[PDB]
Short mmCIF file of C-alpha atoms and ligand atoms in Angstrom, two decimals:
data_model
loop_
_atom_site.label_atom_id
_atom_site.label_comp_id
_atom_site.label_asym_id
_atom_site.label_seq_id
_atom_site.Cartn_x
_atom_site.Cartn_y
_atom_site.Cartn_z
CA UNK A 1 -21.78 2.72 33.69
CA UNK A 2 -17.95 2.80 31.97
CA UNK A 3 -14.94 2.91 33.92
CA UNK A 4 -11.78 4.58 31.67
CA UNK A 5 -8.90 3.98 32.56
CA UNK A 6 -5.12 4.15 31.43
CA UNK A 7 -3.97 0.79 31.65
CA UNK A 8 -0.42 -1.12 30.80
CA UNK A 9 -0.51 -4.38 29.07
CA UNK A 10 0.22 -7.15 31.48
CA UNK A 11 2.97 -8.86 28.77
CA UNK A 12 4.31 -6.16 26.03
CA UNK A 13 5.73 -3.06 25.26
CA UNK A 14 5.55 -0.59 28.13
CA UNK A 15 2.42 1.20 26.44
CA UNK A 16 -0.27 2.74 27.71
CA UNK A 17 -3.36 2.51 26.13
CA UNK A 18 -7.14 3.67 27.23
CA UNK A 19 -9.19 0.57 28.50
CA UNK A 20 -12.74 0.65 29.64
CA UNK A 21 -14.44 -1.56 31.62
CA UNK A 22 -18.23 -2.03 32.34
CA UNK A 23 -20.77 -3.65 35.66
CA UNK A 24 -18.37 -3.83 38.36
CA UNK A 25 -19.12 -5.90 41.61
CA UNK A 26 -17.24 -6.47 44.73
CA UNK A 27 -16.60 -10.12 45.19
CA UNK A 28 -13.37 -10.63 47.30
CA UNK A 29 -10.67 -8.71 49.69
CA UNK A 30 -8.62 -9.18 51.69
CA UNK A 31 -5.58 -7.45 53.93
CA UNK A 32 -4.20 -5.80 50.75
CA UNK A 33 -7.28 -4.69 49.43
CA UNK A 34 -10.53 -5.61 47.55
CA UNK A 35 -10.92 -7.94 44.09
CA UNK A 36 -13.83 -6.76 41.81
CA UNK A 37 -15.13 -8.61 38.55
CA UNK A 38 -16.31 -6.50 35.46
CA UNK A 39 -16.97 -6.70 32.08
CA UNK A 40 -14.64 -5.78 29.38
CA UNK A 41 -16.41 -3.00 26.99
CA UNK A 42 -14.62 -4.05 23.70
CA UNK A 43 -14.04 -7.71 23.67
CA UNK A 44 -17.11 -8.33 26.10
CA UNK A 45 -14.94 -10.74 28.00
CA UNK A 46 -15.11 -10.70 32.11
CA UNK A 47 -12.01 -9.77 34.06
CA UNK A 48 -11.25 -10.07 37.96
CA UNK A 49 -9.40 -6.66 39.35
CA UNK A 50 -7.34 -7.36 42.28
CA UNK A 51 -7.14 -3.33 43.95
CA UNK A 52 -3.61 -3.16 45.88
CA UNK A 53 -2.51 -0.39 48.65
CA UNK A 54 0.53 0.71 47.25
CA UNK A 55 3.36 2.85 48.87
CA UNK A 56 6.11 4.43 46.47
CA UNK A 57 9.00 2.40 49.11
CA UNK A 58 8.15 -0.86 46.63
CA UNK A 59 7.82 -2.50 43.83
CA UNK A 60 4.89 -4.68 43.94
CA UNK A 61 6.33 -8.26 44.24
CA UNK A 62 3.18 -9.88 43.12
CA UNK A 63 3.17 -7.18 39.52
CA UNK A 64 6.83 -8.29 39.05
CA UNK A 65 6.24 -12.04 39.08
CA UNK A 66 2.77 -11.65 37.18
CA UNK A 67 4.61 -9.95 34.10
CA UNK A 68 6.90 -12.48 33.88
CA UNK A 69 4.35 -15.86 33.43
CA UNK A 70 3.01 -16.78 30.30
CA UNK A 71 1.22 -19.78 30.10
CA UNK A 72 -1.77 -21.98 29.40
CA UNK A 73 -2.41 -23.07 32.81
CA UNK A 74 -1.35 -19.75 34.45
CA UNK A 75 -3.87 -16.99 35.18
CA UNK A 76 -3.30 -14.29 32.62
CA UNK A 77 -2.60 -10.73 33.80
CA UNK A 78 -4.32 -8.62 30.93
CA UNK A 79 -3.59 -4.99 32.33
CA UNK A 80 -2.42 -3.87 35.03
CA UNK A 81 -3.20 0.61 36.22
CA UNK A 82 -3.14 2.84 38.57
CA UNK A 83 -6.04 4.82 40.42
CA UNK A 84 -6.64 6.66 43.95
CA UNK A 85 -3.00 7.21 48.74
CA UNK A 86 -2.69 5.26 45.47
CA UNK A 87 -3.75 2.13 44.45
CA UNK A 88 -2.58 -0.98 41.70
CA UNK A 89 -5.19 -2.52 40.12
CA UNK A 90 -4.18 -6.24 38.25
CA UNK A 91 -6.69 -6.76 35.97
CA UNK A 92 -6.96 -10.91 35.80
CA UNK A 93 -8.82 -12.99 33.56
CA UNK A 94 -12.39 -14.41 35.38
CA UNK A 95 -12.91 -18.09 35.60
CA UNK A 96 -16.08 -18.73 37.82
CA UNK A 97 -14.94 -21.75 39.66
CA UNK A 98 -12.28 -23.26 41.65
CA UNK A 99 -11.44 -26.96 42.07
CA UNK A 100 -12.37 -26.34 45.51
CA UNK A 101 -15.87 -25.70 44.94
CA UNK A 102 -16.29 -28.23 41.99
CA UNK A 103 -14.69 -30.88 45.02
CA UNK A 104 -16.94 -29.69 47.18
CA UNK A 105 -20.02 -30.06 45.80
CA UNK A 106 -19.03 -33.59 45.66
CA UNK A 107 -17.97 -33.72 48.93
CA UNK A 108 -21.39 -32.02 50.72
CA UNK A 109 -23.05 -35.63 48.48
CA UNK A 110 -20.86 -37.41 50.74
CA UNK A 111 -19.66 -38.28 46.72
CA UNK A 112 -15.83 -38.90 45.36
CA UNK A 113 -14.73 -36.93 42.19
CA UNK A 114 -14.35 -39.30 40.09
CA UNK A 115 -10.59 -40.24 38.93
CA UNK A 116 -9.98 -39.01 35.29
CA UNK A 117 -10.62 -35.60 37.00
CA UNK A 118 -8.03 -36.44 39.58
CA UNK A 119 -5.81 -37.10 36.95
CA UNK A 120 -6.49 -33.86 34.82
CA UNK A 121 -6.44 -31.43 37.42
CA UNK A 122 -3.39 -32.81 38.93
CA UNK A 123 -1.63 -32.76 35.69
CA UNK A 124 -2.43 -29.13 34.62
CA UNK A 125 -0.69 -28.03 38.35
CA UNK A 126 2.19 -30.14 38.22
CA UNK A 127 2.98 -28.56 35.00
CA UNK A 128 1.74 -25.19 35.86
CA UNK A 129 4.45 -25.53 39.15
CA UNK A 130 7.21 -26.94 36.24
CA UNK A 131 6.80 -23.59 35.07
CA UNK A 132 7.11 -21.64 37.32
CA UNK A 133 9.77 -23.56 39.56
CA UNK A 134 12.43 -23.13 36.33
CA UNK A 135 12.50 -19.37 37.01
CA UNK A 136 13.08 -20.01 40.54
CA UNK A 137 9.86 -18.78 41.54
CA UNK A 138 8.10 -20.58 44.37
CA UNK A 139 4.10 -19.77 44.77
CA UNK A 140 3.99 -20.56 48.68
CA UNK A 141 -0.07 -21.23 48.54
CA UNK A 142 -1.12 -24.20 46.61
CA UNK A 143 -4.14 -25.16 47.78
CA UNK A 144 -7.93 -25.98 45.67
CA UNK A 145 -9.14 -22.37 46.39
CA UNK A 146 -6.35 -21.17 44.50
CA UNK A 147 -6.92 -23.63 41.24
CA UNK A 148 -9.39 -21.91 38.89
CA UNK A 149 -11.52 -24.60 36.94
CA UNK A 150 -13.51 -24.24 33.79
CA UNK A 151 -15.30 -27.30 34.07
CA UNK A 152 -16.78 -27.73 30.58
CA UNK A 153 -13.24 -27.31 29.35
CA UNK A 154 -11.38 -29.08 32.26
CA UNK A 155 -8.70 -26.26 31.92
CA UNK A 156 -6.74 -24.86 34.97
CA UNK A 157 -5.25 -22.07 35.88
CA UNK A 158 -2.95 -21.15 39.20
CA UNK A 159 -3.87 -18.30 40.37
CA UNK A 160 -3.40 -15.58 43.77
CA UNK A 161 0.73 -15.10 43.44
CA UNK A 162 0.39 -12.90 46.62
CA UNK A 163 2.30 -15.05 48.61
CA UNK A 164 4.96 -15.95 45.37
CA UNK A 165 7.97 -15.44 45.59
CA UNK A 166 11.84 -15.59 43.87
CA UNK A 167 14.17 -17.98 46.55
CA UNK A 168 17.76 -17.57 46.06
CA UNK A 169 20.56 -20.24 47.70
CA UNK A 170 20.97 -18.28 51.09
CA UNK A 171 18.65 -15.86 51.58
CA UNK A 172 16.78 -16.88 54.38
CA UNK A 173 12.71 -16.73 53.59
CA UNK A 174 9.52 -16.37 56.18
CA UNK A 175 8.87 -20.17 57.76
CA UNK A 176 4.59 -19.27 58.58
CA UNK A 177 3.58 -19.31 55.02
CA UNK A 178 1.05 -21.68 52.64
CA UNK A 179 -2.35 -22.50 54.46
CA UNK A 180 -1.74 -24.57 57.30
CA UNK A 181 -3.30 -27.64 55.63
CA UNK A 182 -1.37 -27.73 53.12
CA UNK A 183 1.85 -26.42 54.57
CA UNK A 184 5.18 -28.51 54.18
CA UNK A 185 6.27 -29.73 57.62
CA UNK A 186 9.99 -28.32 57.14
CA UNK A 187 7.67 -24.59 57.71
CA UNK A 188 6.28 -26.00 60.60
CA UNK A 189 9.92 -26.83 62.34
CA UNK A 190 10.75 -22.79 61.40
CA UNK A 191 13.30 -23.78 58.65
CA UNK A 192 13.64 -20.86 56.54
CA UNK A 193 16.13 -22.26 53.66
CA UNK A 194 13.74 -23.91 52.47
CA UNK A 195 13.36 -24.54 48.66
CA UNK A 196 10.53 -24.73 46.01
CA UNK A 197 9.35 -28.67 46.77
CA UNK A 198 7.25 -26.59 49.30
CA UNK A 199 4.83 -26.89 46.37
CA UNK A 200 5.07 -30.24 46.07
CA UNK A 201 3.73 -31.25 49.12
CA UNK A 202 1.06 -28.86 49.03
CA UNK A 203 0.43 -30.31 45.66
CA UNK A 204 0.26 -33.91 47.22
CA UNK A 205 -2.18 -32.41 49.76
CA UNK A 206 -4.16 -31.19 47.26
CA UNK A 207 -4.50 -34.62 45.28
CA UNK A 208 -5.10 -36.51 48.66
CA UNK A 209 -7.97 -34.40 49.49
CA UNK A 210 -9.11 -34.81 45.82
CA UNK A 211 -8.98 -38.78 47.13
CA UNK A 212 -10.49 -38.35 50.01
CA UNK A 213 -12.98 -35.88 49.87
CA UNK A 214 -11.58 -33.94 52.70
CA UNK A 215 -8.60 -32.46 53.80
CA UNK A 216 -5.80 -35.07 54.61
CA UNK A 217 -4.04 -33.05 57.92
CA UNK A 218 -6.68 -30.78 59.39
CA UNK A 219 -4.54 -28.92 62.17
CA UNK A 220 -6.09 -26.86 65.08
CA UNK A 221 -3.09 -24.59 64.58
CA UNK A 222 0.63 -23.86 62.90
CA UNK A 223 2.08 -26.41 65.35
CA UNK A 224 -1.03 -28.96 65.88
CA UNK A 225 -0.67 -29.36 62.02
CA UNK A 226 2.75 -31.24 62.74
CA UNK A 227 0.70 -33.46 64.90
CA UNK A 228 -1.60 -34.44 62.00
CA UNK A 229 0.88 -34.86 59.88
CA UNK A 230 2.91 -37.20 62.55
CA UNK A 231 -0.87 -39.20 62.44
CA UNK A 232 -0.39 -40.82 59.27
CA UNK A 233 3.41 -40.72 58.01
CA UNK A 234 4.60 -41.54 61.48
CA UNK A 235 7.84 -39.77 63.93
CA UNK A 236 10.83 -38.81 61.65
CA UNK A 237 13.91 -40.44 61.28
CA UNK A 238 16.80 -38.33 63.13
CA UNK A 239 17.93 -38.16 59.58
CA UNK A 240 14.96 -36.58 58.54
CA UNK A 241 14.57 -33.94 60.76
CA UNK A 242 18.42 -33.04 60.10
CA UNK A 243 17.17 -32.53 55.96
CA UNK A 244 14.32 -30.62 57.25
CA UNK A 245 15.47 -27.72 59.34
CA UNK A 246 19.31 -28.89 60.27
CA UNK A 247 19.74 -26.59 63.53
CA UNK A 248 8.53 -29.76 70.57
CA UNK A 249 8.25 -32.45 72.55
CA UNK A 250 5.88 -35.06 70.42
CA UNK A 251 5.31 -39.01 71.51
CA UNK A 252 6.19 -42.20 68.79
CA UNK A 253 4.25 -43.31 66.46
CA UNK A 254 4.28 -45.49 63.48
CA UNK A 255 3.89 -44.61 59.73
CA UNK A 256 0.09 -45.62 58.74
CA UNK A 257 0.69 -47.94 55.43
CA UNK A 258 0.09 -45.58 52.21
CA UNK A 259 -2.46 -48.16 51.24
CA UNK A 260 -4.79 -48.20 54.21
CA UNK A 261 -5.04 -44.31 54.34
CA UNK A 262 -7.68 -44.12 50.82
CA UNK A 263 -11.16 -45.60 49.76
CA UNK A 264 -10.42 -49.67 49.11
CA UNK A 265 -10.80 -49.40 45.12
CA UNK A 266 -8.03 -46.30 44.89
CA UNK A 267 -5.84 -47.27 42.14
CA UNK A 268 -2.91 -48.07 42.85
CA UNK A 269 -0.80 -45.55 40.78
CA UNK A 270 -2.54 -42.59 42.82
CA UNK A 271 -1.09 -43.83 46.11
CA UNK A 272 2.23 -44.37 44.62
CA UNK A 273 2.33 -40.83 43.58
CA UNK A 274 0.88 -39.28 47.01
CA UNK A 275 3.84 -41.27 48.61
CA UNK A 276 6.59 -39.52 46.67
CA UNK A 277 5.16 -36.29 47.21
CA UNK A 278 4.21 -36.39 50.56
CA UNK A 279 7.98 -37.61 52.35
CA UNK A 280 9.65 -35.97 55.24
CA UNK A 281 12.38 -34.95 53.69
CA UNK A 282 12.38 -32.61 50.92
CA UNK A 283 14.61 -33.43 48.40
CA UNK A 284 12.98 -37.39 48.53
CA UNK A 285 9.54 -35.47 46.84
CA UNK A 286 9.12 -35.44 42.86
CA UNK A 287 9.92 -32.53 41.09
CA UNK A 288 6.49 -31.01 38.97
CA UNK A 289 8.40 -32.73 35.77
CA UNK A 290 8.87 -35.57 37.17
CA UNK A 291 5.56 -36.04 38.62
CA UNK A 292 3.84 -34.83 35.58
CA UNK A 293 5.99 -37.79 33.86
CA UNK A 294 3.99 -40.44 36.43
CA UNK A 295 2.29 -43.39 35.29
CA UNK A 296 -0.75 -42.42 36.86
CA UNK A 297 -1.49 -39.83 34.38
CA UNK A 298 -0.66 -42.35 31.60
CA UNK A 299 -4.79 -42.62 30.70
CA UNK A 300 -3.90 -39.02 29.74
CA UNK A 301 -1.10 -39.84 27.28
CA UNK A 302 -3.07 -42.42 25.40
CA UNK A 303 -4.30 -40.69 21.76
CA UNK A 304 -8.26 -41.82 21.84
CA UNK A 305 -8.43 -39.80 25.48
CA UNK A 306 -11.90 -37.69 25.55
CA UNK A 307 -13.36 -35.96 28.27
CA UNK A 308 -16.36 -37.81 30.02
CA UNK A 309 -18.54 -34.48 28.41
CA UNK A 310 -17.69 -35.98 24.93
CA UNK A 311 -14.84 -33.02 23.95
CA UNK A 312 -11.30 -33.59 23.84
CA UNK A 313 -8.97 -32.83 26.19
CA UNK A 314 -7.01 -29.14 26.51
CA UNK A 315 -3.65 -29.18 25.67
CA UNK A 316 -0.96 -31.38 27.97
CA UNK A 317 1.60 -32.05 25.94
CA UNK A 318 2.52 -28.53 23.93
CA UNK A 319 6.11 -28.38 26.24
CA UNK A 320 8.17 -25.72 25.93
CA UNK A 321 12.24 -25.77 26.37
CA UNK A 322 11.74 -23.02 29.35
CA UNK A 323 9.53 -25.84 30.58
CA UNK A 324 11.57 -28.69 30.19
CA UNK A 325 14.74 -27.60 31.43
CA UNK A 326 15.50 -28.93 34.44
CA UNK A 327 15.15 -32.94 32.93
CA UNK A 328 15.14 -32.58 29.01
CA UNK A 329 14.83 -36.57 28.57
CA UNK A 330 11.70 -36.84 30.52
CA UNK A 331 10.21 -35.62 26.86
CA UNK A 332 10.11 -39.25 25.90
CA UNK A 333 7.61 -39.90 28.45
CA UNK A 334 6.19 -36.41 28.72
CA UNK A 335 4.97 -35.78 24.49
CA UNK A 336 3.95 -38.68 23.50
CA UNK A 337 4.65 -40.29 19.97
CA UNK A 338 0.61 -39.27 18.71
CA UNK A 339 2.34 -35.57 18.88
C1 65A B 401 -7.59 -12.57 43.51
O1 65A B 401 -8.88 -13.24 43.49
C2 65A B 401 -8.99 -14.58 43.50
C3 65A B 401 -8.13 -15.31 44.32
C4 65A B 401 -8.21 -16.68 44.40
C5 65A B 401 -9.13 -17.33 43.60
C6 65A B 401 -10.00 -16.66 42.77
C7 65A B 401 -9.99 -15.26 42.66
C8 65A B 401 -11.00 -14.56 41.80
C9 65A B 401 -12.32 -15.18 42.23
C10 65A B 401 -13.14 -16.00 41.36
N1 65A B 401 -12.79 -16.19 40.09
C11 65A B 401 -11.69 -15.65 39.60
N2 65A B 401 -11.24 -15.73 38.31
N3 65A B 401 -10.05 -15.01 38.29
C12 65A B 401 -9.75 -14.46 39.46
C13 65A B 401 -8.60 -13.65 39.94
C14 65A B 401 -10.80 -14.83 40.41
C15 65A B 401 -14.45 -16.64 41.77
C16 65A B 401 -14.68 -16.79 43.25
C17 65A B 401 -13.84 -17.98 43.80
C18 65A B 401 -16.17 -17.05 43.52
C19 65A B 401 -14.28 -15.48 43.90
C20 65A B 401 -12.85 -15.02 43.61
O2 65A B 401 -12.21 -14.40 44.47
#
């Protein structure tokens, strides 16, 4: 059975052009709609469909920011039409897994991914968040649901930009955003100037549960999630609380040493790099450059680095300028001299 439809291509010209599509199948939804998988007629290739409610008062945020991205560890928007009280379809490229399932299989062995995966993964979103932080836009949902995974390849992709957004010096944004478990405790206090290291410490959240094999700060609710949080990095500083939210009553307690948080034989350079990502306050976190320039992921950088499947690596070090441009001389660290 062929669906026809009259599609836009997600990066080009403004041109219509027929598409048809083949053996769809519900297998999402959500408050804005439904998300459908089918099968490209011509190239044979599969394609998730996120179907959108739209209202003519609106341009579609998530459309906006999608045409925009271009990039290796980005999901790809391929087309993006309209069909029937009208709806958007994004048509998406289909990767079948997510780091969170891959983890989780792990996890359910009571088993620990082991580290060169760690360091992969973790690379591909720092520099997927590079990206997208030098356009100013902020993706407000980091978590492992949200990572697509090819395993055989190791490649991943961000993906869901439902929640992304553009922040702008002084316009104030929405403080209950990111899943709780991975949201930055500056949301939690209600600031709402809040800037794109958001990310970051969901990112850091992401990479300790990659450590742990569970979540790091599993919070009953919005505000018990401080509480969790408070568990292991301890009270703030007066200081800190000022660079979180500047204008809850909760006891004092001290900071649980980085090192006695992980699994004994946790190398060292991992817990260095949770630390500067998961601080208090948010201008003390690495930027994705910067972080993506840690010595943790220097096993990636060396020239004889294989995946444990035999094949080499995807690309990590193809950098553009776009890319690059908020620290230029991190390059000498970043491509190394094999490229
Ligand atoms: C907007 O939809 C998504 C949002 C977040 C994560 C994945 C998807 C979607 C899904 C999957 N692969 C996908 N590849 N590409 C897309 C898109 C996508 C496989 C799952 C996890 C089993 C189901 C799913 O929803």
């Amino acid at each position: 059975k062929v669906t026809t439809v009259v599609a836009t291509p997600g990066q080009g010209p403004d041109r219509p052009q027929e598409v048809s599509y083949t053996d769809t199948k519900v297998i999402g939804n959500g408050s804005f709609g439904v998300v459908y998988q089918a099968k490209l007629c011509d190239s044979g290739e599969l394609v998730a469909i996120k179907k959108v409610l739209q209202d003519k008062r609106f341009k579609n945020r998530e459309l906006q920011i999608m045409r925009k991205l271009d990039h290796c560890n980005i999901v790809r928007l391929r087309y993006f039409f309209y069909s029937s009280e009208v709806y958007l379809n994004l048509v998406l490229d289909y990767v079948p897994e997510t780091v969170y399932r891959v983890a989780r299989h792990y996890s359910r062995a009571k088993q620990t991914l082991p580290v060169i995966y760690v360091k992969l993964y973790m690379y591909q979103l720092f520099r997927s968040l590079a990206y997208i932080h030098s356009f100013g836009i902020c993706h407000r949902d980091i978590k492992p649901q949200n990572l697509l995974l090819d395993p055989d390849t190791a490649v991943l992709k961000l993906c869901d930009f439902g929640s992304a957004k553009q922040l702008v010096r002084g316009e104030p944004n929405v403080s209950y955003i990111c899943s709780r478990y991975y949201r930055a405790p500056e949301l939690i206090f209600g600031a709402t100037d809040y800037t794109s290291s958001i990310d970051v410490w969901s990112a850091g959240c992401v990479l300790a549960e990659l450590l742990l094999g569970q979540p790091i700060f599993p919070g009953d609710s919005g505000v018990d999630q401080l509480v969790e949080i408070i568990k292991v990095l301890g009270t703030p500083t007066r200081e800190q609380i000022r660079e979180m939210n500047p204008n809850f009553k909760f006891p004092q307690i001290k900071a649980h040493p980085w090192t006695k948080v992980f699994r004994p034989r946790t190398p060292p350079e991992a817990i260095a790099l949770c630390s500067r990502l998961l601080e208090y306050t948010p201008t003390a976190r690495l930027t994705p450059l910067e972080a993506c320039a840690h010595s943790f992921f220097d096993e990636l950088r060396d020239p004889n680095v294989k995946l444990p499947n035999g094949r080499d690596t995807p690309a990590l070090f193809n950098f553009t300028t776009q890319e690059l441009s908020s620290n230029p001389p991190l390059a000498t660290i970043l491509i190394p001299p094999h490229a």
